[PDB]
């Protein structure tokens, strides 16, 4: 009981840290594009 | 769990920093010509 | 002169954009991705379901009342990746 | 003998400590959710 | 600074309370150890 | 709250009066993070 | 708390100071034109 239990809880804790992990990095990545589009595009517009 | 929620409130402390800055009324006012735009094709689809 | 700086922020606007089709790429990957996971844990479910009633048909309710618990777990999971699928399809139409 | 009692009082400690320091009331509501799903395969079983 | 001296009196409280859970780990170890004296005692009185 | 409904499901009242207590607790931290967002608006507000 | 309360009593301090020595009356003049200003796009609302 102690490993089905063990086995459970390892794998329910690496797929949900694993998928967490995956969608914080695809939204700091849709940040960044705002940040870069804001940041850069605003800047080099007002430049020209 | 640890790792992983410093990571999450870097993400929502920069996701709460650019909605709070830069999240400017211009941008409403792009969604109401988006709107516009909409209503101008339903018109058109209305007409033929 | 400002005719230069202009062009060449124009230049680097061409990189940025690049690096923004690429992260539409990559967003979309994840999304398909999670649809198949979900995809196939929901054809697992319905496996589960169909081993359910073999042992029903066999009379065997204690490996039924288990092969429904496998059923719950994998609709379960099939909502976490929907729930997961979401916060993609929202930043895929974002950075779109 | 001595020897023997000797390991038999380790390991009695060492069970006190186990249930004593860390025997915590989530693993009775861990049993009351294995009794729920027990319950619910015997639903199954009477419905099949 | 009056931050660095609470955080300093909490970093303390968490050695302390560790040594509190010692405390309750011992403690959970003798009650244990006395619970199965007398239970040996009173299956050696059935014995006689 | 469900932690609550599924003890009072299970008869539990113990631990469903514990885990209102986890609700209360949680909800009074909530109530004392929006007094503190409310100062946090205003000075946003007084900034911007 | 005592070194929380000494920051706390300095914040008030300078915020009694602030408010006090500068909460000069042009500030109720820019409120009464910010106002104004209010009423003003108000009745270009009725206007359109």
Same mark, same amino acid.
């Given at each position: 009981?102690?490993?089905? /239990?063990? +086995?459970?809880?390892?794998? +329910?804790?690496?797929?949900?840290?694993?998928?967490?992990? /995956?969608?914080?990095?695809?939204?700091?990545?849709? /940040?960044?594009?705002?940040?870069?589009?804001?940041?850069?595009?605003?800047?080099?517009?007002?430049?020209? | 769990?640890?790792?992983?929620?410093?990571?999450?409130?870097?993400?929502?402390?920069?996701?709460?920093?650019?909605?709070? *800055?830069?999240?400017?009324?211009?941008?409403?006012?792009?969604?109401? *010509?988006?709107?516009?735009?909409?209503?101008?094709?339903? *018109?058109?689809?209305?007409?033929? | 002169?400002?005719?230069?700086?202009?062009?060449?922020?124009?230049?680097?606007?061409? =990189?940025?954009?690049?690096?923004?089709?690429?992260?539409?790429?990559?967003?979309?990957?994840? =999304?398909?991705?999670?649809?198949?996971?979900? &995809?196939?844990?929901?054809?697992?479910?319905?496996?589960?379901?169909?081993?359910?009633?073999?042992?029903?048909?066999?009379?065997?309710? &204690?490996?039924?009342?288990?092969?429904?618990?496998?059923?719950?777990?994998?609709?379960?999971?099939?909502?976490?990746?929907?729930?997961?699928?979401?916060?993609?399809?929202?930043?895929?139409? &974002?950075?779109?």
């Amino acid at each position: 009981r102690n490993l089905a /239990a063990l +086995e459970a809880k390892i794998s +329910e804790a690496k797929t949900k840290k694993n998928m967490l992990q /995956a969608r914080a990095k695809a939204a700091k990545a849709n /940040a960044e594009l705002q940040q870069t589009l804001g940041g850069l595009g605003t800047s080099s517009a007002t430049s020209a | 769990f640890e790792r992983m929620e410093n990571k999450v409130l870097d993400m929502e402390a920069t996701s709460q920093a650019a909605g709070e *800055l830069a999240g400017f009324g211009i941008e409403n006012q792009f969604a109401q *010509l988006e709107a516009s735009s909409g209503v101008e094709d339903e *018109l058109a689809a209305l007409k033929a | 002169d400002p005719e230069k700086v202009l062009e060449q922020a124009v230049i680097d606007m061409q =990189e940025d954009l690049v690096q923004l089709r690429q992260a539409v790429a990559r967003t979309i990957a994840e =999304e398909k991705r999670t649809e198949q996971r979900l &995809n196939q844990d929901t054809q697992e479910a319905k496996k589960w379901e169909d081993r359910a009633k073999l042992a029903l048909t066999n009379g065997e309710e &204690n490996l039924a009342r288990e092969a429904l618990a496998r059923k719950k777990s994998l609709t379960d999971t099939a909502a976490a990746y929907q729930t997961q699928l979401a916060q993609q399809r929202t930043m895929s139409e &974002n950075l779109r």
